[PDB]
């Protein structure tokens, strides 16, 4: 078998330079759990329709659903 | 001097002479006049789908006594009426009527094939089921 190998002078260098998927393969770091890609995209597009934070129209629709 | 000009500045003559004498050909003429796209019930296509209207007992040309079991077909894209030959023993009994058949040419570049006068196409499919397969009993025809 033939492959490629890297050996760093330290571990902080490795944790700053190596990729996260490889650190995860070696068990040093943890894969941050992420929502699926189109889910993130849908959320971003839902947020794009909001101007500001959302509290104003939140309480407004709370008020207006009684209307 | 064999007719044609040989001079070193006589190429235009040769070109335009070739153009005219190329029109004297058959394949060039059909290709450039666009007869396939303008005529030839297909659109210069390899195949064409059509709807059966009638079954026919076309009599063969001489010297040959036989009846050739063809069908009339209205093409879907053009609406043109076309006679097509159902090639095999007993395969007319899969083409009952109002079927949607696929037609191909026979192989003579638009001419009529043999003892069959006037037909230039053959049936390859009925309802998408391959007359060859139906005849060899590999598949069966749908209900409708």
């Amino acid at each position: 078998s033939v492959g490629f190998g890297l050996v760093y002078n330290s571990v902080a260098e490795a944790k700053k330079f190596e990729p996260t998927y490889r650190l995860v393969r070696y068990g040093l770091a943890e894969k941050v759990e992420k929502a699926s890609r189109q889910q993130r995209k849908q959320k971003k597009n839902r947020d794009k329709k909001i101007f500001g934070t959302g509290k104003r129209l939140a309480k407004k629709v709370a008020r207006r659903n009684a209307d | 001097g064999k007719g044609k000009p040989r001079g070193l500045n006589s190429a235009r003559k040769l070109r335009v002479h070739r153009r005219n004498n190329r029109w004297a050909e058959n394949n060039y003429k059909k290709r450039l006049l666009g007869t396939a796209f303008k005529s030839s019930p297909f659109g210069g296509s390899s195949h064409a789908k059509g709807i059966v209207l009638e079954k026919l007992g076309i009599e063969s040309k001489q010297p040959n006594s036989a009846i050739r079991k063809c069908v009339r077909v209205q093409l879907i894209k053009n609406g043109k009426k076309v006679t097509a030959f159902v090639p095999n023993d007993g395969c007319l009994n899969f083409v009952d009527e109002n079927d949607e058949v696929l037609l191909a040419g026979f192989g003579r570049k638009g001419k009529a094939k043999g003892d069959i006068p006037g037909v230039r196409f053959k049936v390859v499919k009925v309802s998408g089921v391959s007359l060859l397969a139906l005849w060899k009993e590999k598949k069966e025809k749908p209900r409708s």
Binding site: - | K55, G57, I58, E59, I67, K69, D89, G90, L92, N93
Partner: protein, 60 residues
């Protein structure tokens, strides 16, 4: 020419023929083996070299 006729006789012979099922035979070799078989049947075996090296002659 006459386009009509009588479409009743369609399938006459195909219907009349008595059906005869294939005899089950030992499977023939396939590929390099079949080429070996042919080479033997023709060149090292002269099986039928009557005058002209026929391949599928009639029994006589």
């Amino acid at each position: 020419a006459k386009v009509h006729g009588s479409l009743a006789r369609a399938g006459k012979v195909k219907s009349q023929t008595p059906k005869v099922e294939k005899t089950e035979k030992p499977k023939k070799p396939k590929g390099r083996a079949y080429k070996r078989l042919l080479y033997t049947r023709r060149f090292v075996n002269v099986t039928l070299v009557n005058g002209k090296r026929r391949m599928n002659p009639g029994p006589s």
